[PDB]
């Protein structure tokens with residue numbers, strides 16, 4: 001093998017730590033997360049590790065609430081067990097410079113967008129009319 005080329009998704013690669021969150025409780029309520037799970041999930045300050053190997057992107061969340069890991073190819077649906085224990089069908093695409101992650105379950109949908117802004121990685125979680133913004137910094 002040879003050394004492969006970079007990609008635009010390289011802007012997301014690295015080790016990230018959650019530094020702020022807004023409206024996450026309301027997001028989780030809109031998603032249907034129960035009280036005890038919401039309270040514990042809302043305290044977490046995960047690290048998030050993003051890596052790329054060929055076509056495969058891996059997003060690992062290391063958390064005091066729940067450790068999750070997804071590996072995927074852009075545009076190709078996969079099964080995901082979310083930190084709050086939903087079993088969802090997920091598709092992640094790159095639209096411009098934004099990773100757009102759609103999760104489908106039980107006739108419901110939620111979208112998680114991930115975008116670089118200055119030195120941060122901003123995550124916006126959307127369920128119907130409810131948005132949560134989560135900001136990560138380099139660890």
Ligand SMILES: COc1ccc(CCC(=O)O)cc1
Pocket residue numbers: 018028041061082083084112123125134
């Ligand atoms: C409730 O557990 C969750 C659900 C959604 C997320 C997406 C936002 C993020 O990764 O910071 C994280 C933890």
